[PDB]
Amino acid sequence: LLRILKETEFKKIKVLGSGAFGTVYKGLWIPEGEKVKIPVAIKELREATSPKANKEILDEAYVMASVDNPHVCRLLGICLTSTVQLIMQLMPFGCLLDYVREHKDNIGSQYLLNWCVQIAKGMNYLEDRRLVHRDLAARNVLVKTPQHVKITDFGRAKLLGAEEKEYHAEGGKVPIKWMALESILHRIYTHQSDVWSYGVTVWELMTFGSKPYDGIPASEISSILEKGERLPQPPICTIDVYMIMRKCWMIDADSRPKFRELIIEFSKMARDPQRYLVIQGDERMHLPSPTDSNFYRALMDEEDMDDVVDAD
Numbered sequence: 001l002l003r004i005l006k007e008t009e010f011k012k013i014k015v016l017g018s019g020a021f022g023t024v025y026k027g028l029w030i031p032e033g034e035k036v037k038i039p040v041a042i043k044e045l046r047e048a049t050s051p052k053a054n055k056e057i058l059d060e061a062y063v064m065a066s067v068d069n070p071h072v073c074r075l076l077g078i079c080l081t082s083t084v085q086l087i088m089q090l091m092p093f094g095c096l097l098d099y100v101r102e103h104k105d106n107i108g109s110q111y112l113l114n115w116c117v118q119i120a121k122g123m124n125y126l127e128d129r130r131l132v133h134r135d136l137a138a139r140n141v142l143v144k145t146p147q148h149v150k151i152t153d154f155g156r157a158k159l160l161g162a163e164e165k166e167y168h169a170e171g172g173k174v175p176i177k178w179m180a181l182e183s184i185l186h187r188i189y190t191h192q193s194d195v196w197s198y199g200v201t202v203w204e205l206m207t208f209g210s211k212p213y214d215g216i217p218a219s220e221i222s223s224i225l226e227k228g229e230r231l232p233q234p235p236i237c238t239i240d241v242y243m244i245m246r247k248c249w250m251i252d253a254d255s256r257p258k259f260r261e262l263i264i265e266f267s268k269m270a271r272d273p274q275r276y277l278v279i280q281g282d283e284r285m286h287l288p289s290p291t292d293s294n295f296y297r298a299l300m301d302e303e304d305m306d307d308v309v310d311a312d
């Protein structure tokens with residue numbers, strides 16, 4: 001399932017991102033001289049020689065290769081040299097968090113609630129595969145087209161044994177502001193801690209990209225959760241939507257909704273989106289259609305491919 005490829009059959013055209021994760025490139029698969037040039041995303045390990053960093057990207061690659069679903073990102077391939085490179089699908093509109101921030105004045109209720117369904121469907125798929133993501137957040141949801149998003153970033157994902165309910169984590173830097181209380185306090189992750197993370201993710205979307213608990217330092221979060229403080233109701237949210245969010249943040253993990261329930265409830269809501277999200281000018285808001293998206297690709301591909309001509 002892990003397809004080990006030759007690095008030399010890949011051309012890096014653009015740096016799409018660089019950070020803790022390393023570097024992500026827009027790249028071309030060119031296996032036969034000039035005949036086929038297929039766009040991929042390439043994530044490259046920076047700390048080539050780090051035993052820990054090598055463990056993290058090889059665990060990521062292992063989990064990401066095991067997943068076949070329309071709302072999750074699969075690993076196409078891996079290159080092993082002095083470093084590791086994950087070959088992944090190019091997602092032309094990048095991550096959903098940057099997207100909702102950049103396109104807020106054109107995002108309608110129908111797109112917001114569809115994303116909620118799509119992320120729940122994907123999380124439900126991962127649950128059925130016995131995967132606890134442990135890092136669900138709007139930054140870890142990528143946009144193939146405005147109408148089609150996929151969960152990614154399996155760097156923290158853990159595969160549970162059959163009928164095993166929880167994963168007990170060691171020490172490490174953890175995304176406190178997206179974690180269930182039991183995860184913060186006791187390092188316990190389940191499908192239900194993923195449901196807490198999903199609640200924060202919906203909250204990120206409904207606020208067009210607000211940072212959770214803005215200003216409050218991570219160290220104060222377990223304390224505010226214990227006092228019953230949760231993320232505020234986003235202005236566009238009717239109480240029915242904010243109630244699903246609040247249910248995802250109940251102290252008792254088993255009282256939190258199930259991804260399969262969240263699919264049924266967000267789906268219901270997406271059939272009458274303007275009843276459940278109140279957005280000004282919702283009726284006259286437009287985003288690139290799937291065909292307009294294929295165009296945008298072709299436009300950007302053209303200018304990128306022209307920059308490879310006035311270079312190399």
Ligand SMILES: CC(C)c1cnc(N2CC(CS(C)(=O)=O)C2)c2cnc(Nc3ccnc(N4CC[C@@H](O)[C@@](C)(F)C4)n3)cc12
Binds near residue numbers: 016017018095142297
């Ligand atoms: C930084 C990542 C999330 C990223 C950013 N921007 C992209 N763009 C494509 C567009 C320019 S274009 C194509 O129109 O010329 C801006 C990204 C495109 N595709 C991806 N692909 C994937 C596919 C699957 N998984 C990941 N990951 C998961 C692991 C993380 O560490 C990650 C940062 F590598 C993203 N990335 C990412 C784009």
